[PDB]
């Protein structure tokens, strides 16, 4: 399945929100998972949704007030421990220059570049609320002294330097590249006239999302 | 009480239609000028064959610009409608963006800024041939003048054209009641019942507002292929309004 591709897992392996927000509330997007029993408060974060609850009935809470992640108190959390960052970057390099995995999209139909840009925008919005470790009973509380993740920016910079990845991004929705979550992907069972009409056009919704998030949402950096 | 541009455009198009109808009637009277016009009317002008040919050339040269205008607009809107139908056939009815959804009922139920932004994005994507999985943003109810002009020109063309004018048994060919004017009929032996004549399989599809397509199958056009680039041997597939003016 596309969501199990090693590049996607590498790029979506960020640490938990609770690891840097501590026990205090914060403004962030809130995911609820029906399988793990996370409803009516007791809600997880985006990283937990992508990693801890991959395959569960995890959705986004539209009416989201300020909240923290408590995935630890209800299920086994794989996002509380962060691996070696240098090894992560090295593996990203090797997977970019060794396999054409970057061309394949994920289960949501978004190419790796779009996912990385959206992650960078969301992280820039959220991490500004990170209170540093100010100096001034719960023994099972997870460790909460680690910095917020900073891998998304490096991954975006390095993937943008790759020609194949950028070409697959920009030519996404064209004749060759077609996302599974698009009505024009499977049209081989239609009448030839409808096939011609659908085949004439090319897709630019994903490219428009990528450009909009790169230009108007990623306000933090010009790099 | 309203002071709308569309009303003025429609009224001017109506006047143009009246004038074009009169022109077509006059030119159709040319072949029988002597029997109908010359003898009965005391004061008539002698007409010669070369005069009639020059007259026809003059009329065609004068009507060319409006003809190009209507052809461009109509090819554009037909391409938009055909793409919408194809996407509806290839789309998910549950999504709010599907053509065949209640949200698109246009009577049961965004901001003005959002509407204009949608229109602008649709125009740009259509021009660059990039309108995929997004419904074209168009208002056919605002094309009344184009309708009048097209009606007038088709009237002129039809009137003057009528002025000019066991296998394969007449029993085996589709009749007027089912055939589509200008489209070849589905081959009676290749296609099954469920897709040739859907009404026979499902006789409850008969409704007062029921399309002929879903009652007697989807016809096809013999265009695009078979070479030639006359501009009408190639089907209208491009969705902008410039390329169908270039064509
Ligand atoms: Zn979490
Ligand atoms: Zn779960
Ligand atoms: Zn977790």
Curated annotation (Swiss-Prot), chain A:
<comment type="function">
    <text>E3 ubiquitin-protein ligase involved in different protein quality control pathways in the cytoplasm and nucleus. Mainly acts as a ubiquitin chain elongator that extends pre-ubiquitinated substrates. Component of the N-end rule pathway: ubiquitinates proteins bearing specific N-terminal residues that are destabilizing according to the N-end rule, leading to their degradation. Recognizes type-1 N-degrons, containing positively charged amino acids (Arg, Lys and His).</text>
</comment>
<feature type="binding site">
    <location>
        <position position="77"/>
    </location>
    <ligand>
        <name>Zn(2+) 3</name>
    </ligand>
</feature>
<feature type="modified residue" description="Phosphoserine">
    <location>
        <position position="182"/>
    </location>
</feature>
<feature type="binding site">
    <location>
        <position position="52"/>
    </location>
    <ligand>
        <name>Zn(2+) 3</name>
    </ligand>
</feature>
<comment type="subunit">
    <text>(Microbial infection) Interacts with human T-cell leukemia virus 1/HTLV-1 protein HBZ; this interaction modulates HBZ stability.</text>
</comment>
<feature type="binding site">
    <location>
        <position position="33"/>
    </location>
    <ligand>
        <name>Zn(2+) 2</name>
    </ligand>
</feature>
<feature type="binding site">
    <location>
        <position position="53"/>
    </location>
    <ligand>
        <name>Zn(2+) 2</name>
    </ligand>
</feature>
<feature type="binding site">
    <location>
        <position position="48"/>
    </location>
    <ligand>
        <name>Zn(2+) 3</name>
    </ligand>
</feature>
<feature type="modified residue" description="Phosphoserine">
    <location>
        <position position="202"/>
    </location>
</feature>
<protein>
    <recommendedName>
        <fullName>E3 ubiquitin-protein ligase UBR5</fullName>
    </recommendedName>
</protein>
<feature type="binding site">
    <location>
        <position position="45"/>
    </location>
    <ligand>
        <name>Zn(2+) 1</name>
    </ligand>
</feature>
<feature type="zinc finger region" description="UBR-type">
    <location>
        <begin position="14"/>
        <end position="82"/>
    </location>
</feature>
<feature type="binding site">
    <location>
        <position position="16"/>
    </location>
    <ligand>
        <name>Zn(2+) 1</name>
    </ligand>
</feature>
<comment type="subunit">
    <text>Homotetramer; composed of a dimer of dimers. Associates with CDK9 and TFIIS/TCEA1 and forms a transcription regulatory complex made of CDK9, RNAP II, UBR5 and TFIIS/TCEA1 that can stimulate target gene transcription (e.g. gamma fibrinogen/FGG) by recruiting their promoters. Associates with the E3 ligase complex containing DYRK2, EDD/UBR5, DDB1 and DCAF1 proteins (EDVP complex). Binds TOPBP1. Interacts with PIH1D1. Interacts with CIB1.</text>
</comment>
<feature type="binding site">
    <location>
        <position position="36"/>
    </location>
    <ligand>
        <name>Zn(2+) 2</name>
    </ligand>
</feature>
<comment type="similarity">
    <text>Belongs to the UBR5 family.</text>
</comment>
<feature type="binding site">
    <location>
        <position position="69"/>
    </location>
    <ligand>
        <name>Zn(2+) 1</name>
    </ligand>
</feature>
<feature type="binding site">
    <location>
        <position position="48"/>
    </location>
    <ligand>
        <name>Zn(2+) 1</name>
    </ligand>
</feature>
<feature type="binding site">
    <location>
        <position position="56"/>
    </location>
    <ligand>
        <name>Zn(2+) 2</name>
    </ligand>
</feature>
<feature type="binding site">
    <location>
        <position position="71"/>
    </location>
    <ligand>
        <name>Zn(2+) 3</name>
    </ligand>
</feature>
<feature type="modified residue" description="Phosphoserine">
    <location>
        <position position="64"/>
    </location>
</feature>
């Amino acid at each position: 399945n596309p969501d199990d591709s090693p590049l996607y897992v590498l790029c979506c392996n960020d640490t938990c929100s609770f690891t840097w927000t501590g026990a205090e509330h914060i403004n962030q997007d809130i995911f609820e998972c029906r399988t793990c029993g996370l409803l009516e408060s007791l809600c997880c974060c985006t990283e937990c949704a992508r990693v801890c609850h991959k395959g569960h009935d995890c959705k986004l809470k539209r009416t989201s007030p300020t909240a923290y992640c408590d995935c630890w108190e209800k299920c086994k959390c794989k996002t509380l421990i962060a691996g070696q960052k240098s090894a992560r970057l090295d593996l990203l390099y090797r997977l970019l220059t060794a396999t054409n995995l970057v061309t394949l999209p994920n289960s949501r139909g978004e190419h790796l570049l779009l996912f990385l840009v959206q992650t960078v925008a969301r992280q820039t919005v959220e991490h500004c609320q990170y209170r540093p470790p100010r100096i001034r009973e719960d023994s099972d509380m997870p460790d909460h002294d680690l910095e917020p993740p900073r891998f998304a920016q490096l991954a975006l910079e390095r993937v943008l330097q790759d020609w194949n990845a950028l070409k697959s991004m920009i030519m996404f929705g064209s004749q060759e590249n077609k996302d599974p979550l698009s009505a024009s992907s499977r049209i081989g069972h239609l009448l030839p006239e409808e096939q011609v009409y659908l085949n004439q056009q090319s897709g630019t919704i994903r490219l428009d999302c990528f450009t909009h998030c790169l230009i108007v949402k990623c306000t933090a950096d010009i790099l | 009480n309203a002071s709308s541009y569309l009303t003025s455009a429609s009224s001017l198009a109506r006047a143009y239609s009246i004038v074009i109808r009169q022109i077509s009637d006059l030119m159709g009277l040319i072949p029988k000028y002597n029997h109908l016009v010359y003898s009965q009317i005391p004061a008539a002008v002698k007409l010669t064959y070369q005069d009639a040919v020059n007259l026809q050339n003059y009329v065609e040269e004068k009507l060319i610009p409006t003809w190009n205008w209507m052809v461009s607009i109509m090819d554009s809107t037909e391409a938009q409608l055909r793409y919408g139908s194809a996407l509806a056939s290839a789309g998910d009815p549950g999504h709010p963006n599907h053509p065949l959804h209640a949200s698109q009922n246009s009577a049961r139920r965004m901001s003005a800024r959002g509407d204009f932004l949608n229109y602008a994005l649709s125009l740009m994507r259509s021009h660059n041939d990039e309108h995929s999985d997004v419904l074209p943003v168009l208002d056919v109810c605002s094309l009344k003048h184009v309708a009048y002009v097209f009606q007038a020109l088709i009237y002129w063309i039809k009137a003057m054209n009528q002025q000019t004018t066991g296998q394969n048994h007449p029993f085996f060919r589709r009749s007027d009641s089912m055939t589509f004017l200008g489209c070849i009929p589905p081959n009676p032996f290749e296609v099954p019942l469920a897709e040739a004549i859907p009404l026979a399989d499902q006789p409850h599809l008969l409704q007062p507002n029921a399309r002929k397509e879903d009652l007697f199958g989807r016809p096809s056009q013999g265009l695009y292929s078979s070479s030639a680039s006359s501009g009408k041997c190639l089907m209208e597939v491009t969705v902008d309004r410039n390329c169908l003016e270039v064509l």
